Amino acid sequence: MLKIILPSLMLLPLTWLSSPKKTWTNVTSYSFLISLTSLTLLWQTDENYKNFSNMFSSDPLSTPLIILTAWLLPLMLMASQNHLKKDNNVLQKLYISMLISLQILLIMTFSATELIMFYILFEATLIPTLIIITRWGNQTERLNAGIYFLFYTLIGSIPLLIALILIQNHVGTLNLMILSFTTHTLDASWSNNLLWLACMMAFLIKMPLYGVHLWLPKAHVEAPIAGSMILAAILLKLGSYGMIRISIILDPLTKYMAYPFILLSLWGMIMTSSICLRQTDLKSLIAYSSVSHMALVIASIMIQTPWSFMGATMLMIAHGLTSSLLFCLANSNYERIHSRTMIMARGLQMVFPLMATWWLMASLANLALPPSINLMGELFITMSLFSWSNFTIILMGINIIITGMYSMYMIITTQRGKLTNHMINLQPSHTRELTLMALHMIPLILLTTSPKLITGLTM
Amino acid sequence: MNPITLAIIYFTIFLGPVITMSSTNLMLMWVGLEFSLLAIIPMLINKKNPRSTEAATKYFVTQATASMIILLAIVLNYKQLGTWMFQQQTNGLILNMTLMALSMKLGLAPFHFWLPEVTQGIPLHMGLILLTWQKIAPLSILIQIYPLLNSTIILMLAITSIFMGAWGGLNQTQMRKIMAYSSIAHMGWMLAILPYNPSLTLLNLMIYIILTAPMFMALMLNNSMTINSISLLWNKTPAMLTMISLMLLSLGGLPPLTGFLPKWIIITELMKNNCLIMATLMAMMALLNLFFYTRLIYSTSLTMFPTNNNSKMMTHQTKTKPNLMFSTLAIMSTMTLPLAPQLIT
Amino acid sequence: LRYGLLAAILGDKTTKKLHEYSRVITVDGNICSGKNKLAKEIAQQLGMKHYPEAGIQYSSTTTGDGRPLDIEFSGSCSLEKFYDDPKSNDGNSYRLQSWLYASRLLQYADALEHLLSTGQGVVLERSIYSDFVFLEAMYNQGYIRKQCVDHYNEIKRLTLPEYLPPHAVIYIDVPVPEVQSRIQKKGDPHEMKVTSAYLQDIENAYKKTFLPKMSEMCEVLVYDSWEAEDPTKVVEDIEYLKYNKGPWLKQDDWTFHYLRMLVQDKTEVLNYTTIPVYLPEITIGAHQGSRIYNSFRELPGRKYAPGYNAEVGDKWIWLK
Amino acid sequence: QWQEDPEPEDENVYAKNPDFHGYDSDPVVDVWNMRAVFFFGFSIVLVFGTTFVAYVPDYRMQEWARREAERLVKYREVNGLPIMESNYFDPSKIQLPED
């Protein structure tokens, strides 16, 4: 794991020592090489998990998240290159440093084998996202968005810290593999119910429920493109990863203690898809779509079926890729027009043909299309939920119908129709942003071609 | 001033806590406390403004009353046992009076009302000397009687100091009052961990001191008094901003800054002693502390407040920053979390 | 900062290095009345150091290369534009006045540092004690507003009483028509567009406030033009002056030491001129302020501390 | 009002560099950034990484489990054993609590 962490650590001296005319080139190229290096722990021949160190470990669950983070860092650099062109060199290098530190801390978080170290790196990732959102956001409400994001996360995470220290004082180790082996059943008391709530609510805040979710649209609207990318593609999945990790020591009482959150997830995915239907902001629409998909992930992890876990992992990776792609496309239009109003730019398929192709493919990934890991994850989540109770299929069907409706509504209202001819400042395309869309979409095709990698722990 | 009386006053300021922490007689601890108070008063009232006079008066009467209660406890112990130290079988009333009076010396709630008043209206270096150096001798006496303390009164004082400090720092806009309420909250944490581990309150005291020394140094550099005054720091000293933000986050207790370590290890020890209710309440009010720190960070670092015309002349001139004191303490107070097993003792 | 408590203990006493001509002499008068030449001659034949009137570019001339900077780096005053059109939509009159007050404050601090460090007397032209005359003339002519006046008075209250008044205040009384004739004969096209009411306002402010308020703390040497335009009778008066009042008599070595510290730290001198009172004539805003600050740091000799600039010299960069 | 710079208009980047690739204002850094992104992002990580992942063998013992299942099914069929015995663990080595 150190062979991946240390080059990413040395990215920062490269960033601060590179010439100002070569900084973006050097950091982007070496971060691509670091992702290529991070591809090496897919070499999983045996069923044994790759335990490199006494503190670092690999997993069929942790590996796709690490590879996605290492892949997404150069994509964030490419996306954030254009909107920092009229900026001080020190500020540009500081922004690149924030992105690189996010990548380092997230790789360490996913590869950490101890829950307390996972918590430390969890809040360590909480810091530079706040700095990015507040310092480089565009509108006034970035400060409110940062406050909401930070303190939703912290009020979630403090009972998680209390619960982790309780578990460490009880069993003596707080190591994931020792807990997984000598896990102990809980005697179903009110203290154990509160312990379950304390160790769940941090991750239930971090990936959005129907309740606490109000920080996500604010942060996504007010964040720059790299911040939206890192949030919607890694941090919600970080909450899901934490839930999958910590659910193993709560064996007997999850089967009744998970009831309110399953209902909250299903009805909330319906309501957030409805908001996507009647939403006037493109980034808000993508954010609420992310809430709906993560609600599906919450329901699968709560019902704790092998099909549910596999579908949860597939939906995690697929949703990260397609949400980053949608955010990048919306950011390209926003860099053209300097407004996120959805109804204002309408006939963009006329002037941007292949960007419209990327829009069409991104929306076909957003809805569940059967040659895609999106439909793979959503379909196996549906199968596990219907096994859990047959009446969940009604909520699933309503969610799928509204999902198709808001995705095709997005395509029709922002690409098709008569072109708003008054918008003179529609530059043709940047090879950079077309490359950005291609680097989002081609991994979706490859993971569709071989979905055994995205299958998680259970099979 | 005058170098001779400067030497006398500063040597007595040093000598007070040294006598208190190195003397095994309660009477000599009390005369060390008296040394500290009487020596620090002329340093407080030095600018000879009405606010300095009021702060000196308030500080004098508060510390004199608290020291008189301390001396009452010492004399009652001497009456009961004939010794000059609370050995093991003293009266709980005597011990509770000792704890209450030392709490009023320290300035934690509900005896906290004078501390933002005295810290306001006093120059920044004297506020630093107060909020760091004056809190070692009463803490030394409290550490000396490590058992035989009332955990109920300790936990009540700790929880109300953390609550009132979080609320006060949330309300205040004056930087010195913000630092005073931060002092009240951190003293609440130290007092909370006092009857279970003296090492952890010593560790939290050291972390707090090395965290708020460079905060006061950075305030002292530009003589910044208010939130607006610290907000126009991007034009005055733009290199300060990252260290200011990191130290404010470390005072908030965010990982992976080393200010997370004292709260983390105190919560660990309280889990070991089964005080989950107190630990949870303390952690939530520490989140409130972090909120007013983060509002300060928004004002000074992550946004750029408007500046005025004369800051051009300020940029024309040259400055001077203390070597070996600011940068060393800032680095040791931000990036020393992976040395946590070495820090705990 | 070489000077400090240690240097004062080892012996750097101002009263030890004082002298019978270690005086602060401030020359004052109206817009065009012989005060630049008079101060030059007084310093010349008293052995003082002549400080000309602190203009817009005083900090630019006294810091860095010494060449005047751009009109946006050194304030935004434009005295020519003030003469062309006061009462502008942007606040230029009060910006010019506040910048001139801060420049005069820096000049007074430099003069005090020179006098306390070397013992040589200084002759200033129109120190900080005679800048409120310009501010009150601006206000009474309607060029600025009461908010600007209150902000100026707040800065003056914060900065002025921390220093010492001049030993002698020489004044050159001259009638307003004579000032008008001298201004017209000078020939500056911007300065020709001054109001006789404005000049009379400056003279009235002088006579009504400056002369008594300084007479109660030092001595005043009001002259006419014929008593002036002859810089030898004035020098003889200064030689046979008696310094028997004011706060220069009640102070000693350690008061001088603390004043010398406060006056050699220039950021402490200019600290209260940058109070965050958000007057729209004075406050700037983040984008323009950051553009100006970055461009000023990209000026030569300004990117780092003055000891550390390889583009202009400073060869021993790696050992200091 | 305060002394603020106005909102700047956004320049047509293709007005001065008609071969603009999205990366940098001057053409040389722009074209070299384009080449670096394409080479390091499509050539050596989307092809060599794909080949490496494709030739990872026996990914989580799938082919091994195929061969082992074929061997066990063949053995239990030709030896008449009940293929896939109902109990995993042998009942003789499990001690049940009394009554």
């Binding site: - | 407040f305 408007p306 | - | 305060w2």
Partner: peptide, 19 residues
């Protein structure tokens, strides 16, 4: 568009010693 920075209103909401 241009990044919003605090104006006189946002800068004056932090004065008053009570918040």
């Amino acid at each position: 568009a241009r990044q919003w920075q605090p104006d006189i209103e946002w800068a004056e909401q932090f004065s008053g010693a009570v918040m």
